[PDB]
Swiss-Prot record, chains A, B:
Pathway(s) of this molecule: Lipid metabolism; fatty acid metabolism
Protein name, entry field: Stearoyl-[acyl-carrier-protein] 9-desaturase, chloroplastic
Signal peptide boundaries: none
Cofactor note as given: Binds 2 Fe(2+) ions per subunit.
Quaternary structure annotation from Swiss-Prot or TrEMBL: Homodimer.
Upper taxonomic lineage: Eukaryota, Viridiplantae, Streptophyta, Embryophyta, Tracheophyta
Superkingdom, taxonomy of origin: Eukaryota
GO molecular function, one term: metal ion binding
Record localization: Plastid, Chloroplast; Plastid
InterPro entries named in the record: FADS-2_CS, Fatty_acid_desaturase-2, Ferritin-like_SF, RNR-like
GO biological process: fatty acid biosynthetic process
Family: Belongs to the fatty acid desaturase type 2 family.
PANTHER family (UniProt xref): ACYL- ACYL-CARRIER-PROTEIN DESATURASE-RELATED, STEAROYL-[ACYL-CARRIER-PROTEIN] 9-DESATURASE 7, CHLOROPLASTIC
Length: 345, 345
């Protein structure tokens, strides 16, 4: 009974003529976006951070990795696992980009700057799942069979980000998510360092670093959008906010916990890896980064949107930081990812 | 210096009103196609065939896996690695299904039987790469860094199967590829057994088993199409042959071998894992499976197509027998996947 989306499938809400804007922004993309891709030969590979199987020190390397992992609490592992599962659901993320009307890859090998980005970006993201996958496997602290089962469900469930085939909505979404992952991965890195594991810290930090570049490239695309059409891009930014930015791995199911994503989130929230406050903080940043506040010539509708967008961040901060129920009075609960061992929610 | 396609990029060759056919078939697929998907809870997982990190026998299990791997020659590993790399390029494969006009997933979680298949099939395929990846990693016989570099290139390069957004062309293609992998995986399974490794044989066999079910479901779709649009399914089958079925990992590049795919292919051919003879054998099987020769009531060019399709297999066979140089007089060559050690081509 994998969780299904509880909304109506809305497709192509963006005007068919606006597609031209994107085909026109092709050479612009090639100059200002594709430069944020690290070339393959200068990229780190998972093997750079894992025990070397072709070295005489393989055994002791694996043994050390496993000794340090015992010093890392189950709490941390549940979050780390959730992050890994999200990364492994990659095919879905390339699919969401290819649903966007003006930017999609029509053949799977298209020479368009947008297609090249989609494929190259996916290529980079693939290393994130591989690295975290081999690490958790060697640690011996988690149940890979349940994790693998959760991954099969997730990919099969896919996800609907509510972007409606619109590059305007889509790029707002991705800019958000990238910063979200940059935070999660940055926090796990910081904590992993305190539990005494610097190599795990290098791992999460290196993944985070990739996230920032992706963030940089995506925010730029939206920056040009506010230039060509401040009004419509403001409307889109607002539309996503009303809808709310739903996380990609929100349909998470391990065959036995119907509220797996909420439970996973609760532990991340509690640990300070990704709190509800950060949702607001990312919003606040994006508003200030795009200077939504400093926009003019907007219609009464676009004026309403701009105001709504600028007012939301402090509003949410008040609303979501007040949590007392889940926080201190959170019950303990078992996670199949950790052989049903229990952690506080 | 990654190999790009040497063909003009043609799109949507399929007549738009034919898209409604699939829209209609949506319930038939739910009845005869979606039944070929093994439910998640009844599916094997990679951990079922790899050393158990949460067991006391982990060390000896890995040690044994590594001892057996020394008995397996570099020739075998080059092929095994090429097969794994192809599996890992999965995002590209889900994308190629989503480019098909009538069966594409417009949201990333569309409730259509076609989208459900796309997502579930991809979920199943994910386990193939994971398993082969963890295996090659533990073996200590290959260079994971170079292999990982080749995968990043491949995903970045994508691929164009020349299906032109046509479900008619697409399902012919996939039916072919599924049988191709079933063969490759079955052959490596058999050979692995001869080198004394039954666990590697179980691994390759279990993956092959999944390929057969996928083949069964795909051939059924073309089967039902051969009924509805006899003439069209004749021209499509012929168009593909004209173009030739290009393998998905044909743009393979490791940063130092420009003809990586050809060199990889030469070794598989030599080993008998996937010979050029198999290409013809698969075509012959498909012609006979769909009963192409029996299709009466065919229009003029459809008659030309049916004949061409029926006569091609024996022609290819004869045209593929005369290979004196390729494998017999074959030079030795280094592969970065194996730390530049050399195998005969
Ligand atoms: Fe990532
Ligand atoms: Fe990213
Ligand atoms: Fe496969
Ligand atoms: Fe398959």
């Amino acid at each position: 009974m994998p969780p299904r989306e509880v909304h109506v499938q809305v497709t192509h809400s963006m005007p068919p003529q606006k597609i031209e804007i994107f085909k026109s922004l092709d050479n612009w993309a090639e100059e200002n976006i594709l430069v944020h891709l690290k070339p393959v030969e200068k990229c780190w590979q998972p093997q750079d951070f894992l025990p070397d199987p072709a070295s005489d020190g393989f055994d002791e390397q694996v043994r050390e990795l496993r000794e340090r992992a015992k010093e890392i609490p189950d709490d941390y592992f549940v979050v780390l696992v959730g992050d890994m599962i999200t990364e492994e659901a990659l095919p879905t993320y390339q699919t969401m980009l290819n649903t966007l009307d003006g930017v999609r890859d029509e053949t799977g090998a298209s020479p368009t700057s947008w297609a090249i980005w989609t494929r190259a970006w996916t290529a980079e993201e693939n290393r994130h799942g591989d690295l975290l996958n081999k690490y958790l496997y060697l640690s011996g602290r988690v149940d890979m069979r349940q994790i693998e089962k959760t991954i099969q469900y997730l990919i099969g469930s896919g996800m609907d980000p509510r972007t409606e085939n619109s590059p305007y909505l889509g790029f707002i979404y991705t800019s958000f998510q990238e910063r979200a992952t940059f935070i999660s991965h940055g926090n796990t890195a910081r904590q992993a360092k305190e539990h005494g594991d610097i190599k795990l810290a290098q791992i999460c930090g290196t993944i985070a670093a990739d996230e920032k570049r992706h963030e940089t490239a995506y925010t730029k695309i939206v920056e040009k959008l506010f230039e060509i059409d401040p009004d419509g891009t403001v409307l889109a930014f607002a539309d996503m906010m009303r809808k709310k930015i739903s996380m990609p791995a929100h349909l998470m199911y391990d065959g036995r916990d119907d509220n797996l994503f909420d439970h996973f989130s609760a532990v991340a929230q509690r640990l300070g890896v990704y709190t509800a406050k950060d949702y607001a903080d990312i919003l606040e940043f994006l508003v200030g980064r795009w200077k939504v506040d400093k926009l003019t010539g907007l219609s009464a509708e676009g004026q309403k949107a701009q105001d709504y967008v600028c007012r939301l961040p402090p509003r949410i901060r008040r609303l979501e930081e007040r949590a007392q129920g889940r926080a201190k009075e959170a019950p303990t609960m078992p996670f199949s990812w950790i052989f049903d061992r229990q952690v506080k929610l």
